[PDB]
Swiss-Prot record, chains A, B:
GO MF annotations in UniProt: gap junction channel activity
Organism: Ovis aries
Transmembrane regions listed in the UniProt entry: 21-41, 71-91, 119-139, 168-188
Function: Structural component of eye lens gap junctions. Gap junctions are dodecameric channels that connect the cytoplasm of adjoining cells. They are formed by the docking of two hexameric hemichannels, one from each cell membrane. Small molecules and ions diffuse from one cell to a neighboring cell via the central pore.
Subunit structure: A hemichannel or connexon is composed of a hexamer of connexins. A functional gap junction is formed by the apposition of two hemichannels. Forms heteromeric channels with GJA3.
Record localization: Cell membrane; Cell junction, Gap junction
Name of the protein in question: Gap junction alpha-8 protein
Ranges within the bilayer without spanning: 1-11
Disulphide linkage map: 53-158, 60-152, 64-147
Extracellular side: 42-70, 140-167
Shown segment, full-protein numbering: 2 to 236 of 440
Length: 193, 193
């Protein structure tokens, strides 16, 4: 997809942020969005097309693929990016609002609170998405999925496409998110000092 | 198949037998062999060809059909006929042997024992085949057979050809065999008197 607008706003943010914050935005762009667009999206391109179940029951493949993957990982990661970005948008909006107010007439006591809260919310969203991914899928995609969802007769064997590659990228994204967390915590500590 | 030779011998027997015995041979011919040849054999003609399993596993249909029907009913009935006929052959052979012996030089004390024993053995074979059929297949062929025999993945659904018609003929043959038993018992009683 096209991320140009979000990139515009976030680049604008870069100016109004801590050094750790600029590192965080660089990470967001390079190791999440770029990889999604150029590496991961191709990996999941044939997720359902090459999902194959050992049966001749009509509709069994559509229901078994939907059971194994209620939301695809790539879409989960899209949502994750958007939600961890939103607070930064809030903060830069507050900043530009104060700027226009001063013109009509940096991290002051008024902004500081908003900035800290935005770091806090980035952290909360990151942790939430990581936990949700863990419970939904674990962190490994196994090649065999056994499904007993109607209309499938008894339990059928279905086989996932590219399970090892998908696992590699799952773990890669997990690590990127953990790095984001570390950065957020160090930024809170730096402000504290 | 061609039953002409057995028919020759058994027709020869008809002369050397009790009235109940002639009824028994008439039953054997009309209600077992004729039906097999003209009715039942067509019913089971497509037993494996129209046996269908819901799977795309190669070899699953050959192993699931062999599990459901280790011996086909028609072949079981063939064997049954042959084995219940053998003792009558023994007895008529004994009779012709005594005839030739007398020529060189009816139910006497010598034959009577053999005759009674041959009735007894007809009865034993009939009972044995009936019991064996009961344990192997019950007396109803259900339309759905569920099979978990390698190479089938998990349990698969297989569907039998002509289950209701096959059930009708199963019960018909059971009844014929029971009539044979009643005849044998009445023949033993008649001799006893
Ligand atoms: C302003 C923020 C408002 C957040 C409101 C969140 C409301 C979550 C309601 C979850 C209800 C689950 C009911 C349940 O249990 O029925 C499923 C069964 O039982 C189970 O399987 C156990 C399921 C356990 C789910 C635990 C979810 C914890 C979510 C914590 C969110 C913290 C946000 C700060
Ligand atoms: C279904 C439990 O079925 P199962 O365990 O047998 O399925 C095994 C997993 N399989 C369904 C993918 C096969 O129910 C679940 O697991 C529901 C898991 C919920 C995952 C998402 C949690 C909330 C994410 C919040 C993100 C936003 C925060 C800012
Ligand atoms: C700053 C962010 C950094 C985070 C980097 C995360 C990288 C994670 C790479 C490998 C994770 C999954 C490995 C796997 O899932 O392997 C299991 C599989 C045997 O599983 P099984 O079926 O025997 O049970 O292994 C096999 O045998 C087949 C061979 C698999 C070799 C895959 C090597 C991938 C190397 C990627 C390097 C990326 C550099 C950035
Ligand atoms: C001259 C005539 C000689 C006849 C010789 C017959 C020998 C039969 C041996 C059967 C051995 C079964 C062993 C067994 O049991 O391993 C299977 C398990 O256990 C089970 O499932 C229980 C299986 C129960 C099978 C009962 C068969 C009774 C056959 C009576 C034949 C009477 C003929 C007059
Ligand atoms: C297998 C028990 O497996 P199952 O009960 O799960 O199979 C269910 C039946 N299904 C194998 C046809 C599906 O073992 C058996 O039943 C063996 C049953 C034996 C049937 C024939 C007994 C002897 C006949 C003698 C005739 C000659 C006398 C003169
Ligand atoms: C001296 C020797 C005489 C022995 C004669 C034995 C004759 C046995 C005839 C019927 C036995 C099986 C009936 C059956 O198996 O029926 C079950 C089926 C419902 O089973 P379900 O799937 O609902 O559970 O019935 C249905 O609904 C579908 C309709 C089935 C009607 C079949 C009528 C056959 C009449 C044959 C007459 C032969 C005259 C010599």
């Amino acid at each position: 997809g096209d991320w140009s607008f979000l990139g515009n706003i976030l680049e604008e943010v870069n100016e109004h942020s801590t050094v750790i914050g600029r590192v965080w935005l660089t990470v967001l762009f390079i190791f999440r969005i770029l990889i999604l667009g150029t590496a991961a999206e191709f990996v999941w391109g044939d997720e359902q097309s090459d999902f194959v179940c050992n049966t001749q029951q009509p509709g069994c493949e559509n229901v078994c693929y939907d059971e194994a993957f209620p939301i695809s990982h790539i879409r989960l990661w899209v949502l994750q990016i958007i939600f961890v970005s939103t607070p930064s948008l809030v903060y830069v909006g507050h900043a530009v609002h104060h700027v226009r107010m001063e013109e009509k007439r940096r991290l002051e006591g008024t902004l500081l609170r908003t900035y800290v809260c935005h770091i806090i919310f980035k952290t909360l969203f990151e942790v939430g998405f990581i936990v949700g991914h863990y419970f939904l899928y674990g962190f490994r995609i196994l090649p065999l999925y056994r499904c007993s969802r109607w209309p499938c007769p008894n339990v059928v064997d279905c086989f996932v496409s590219r399970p090892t590659e998908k696992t590699i990228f799952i773990l890669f994204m997990l690590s990127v998110a953990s790095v984001s967390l570390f950065l957020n915590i160090l930024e809170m500590s730096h402000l504290g000092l």
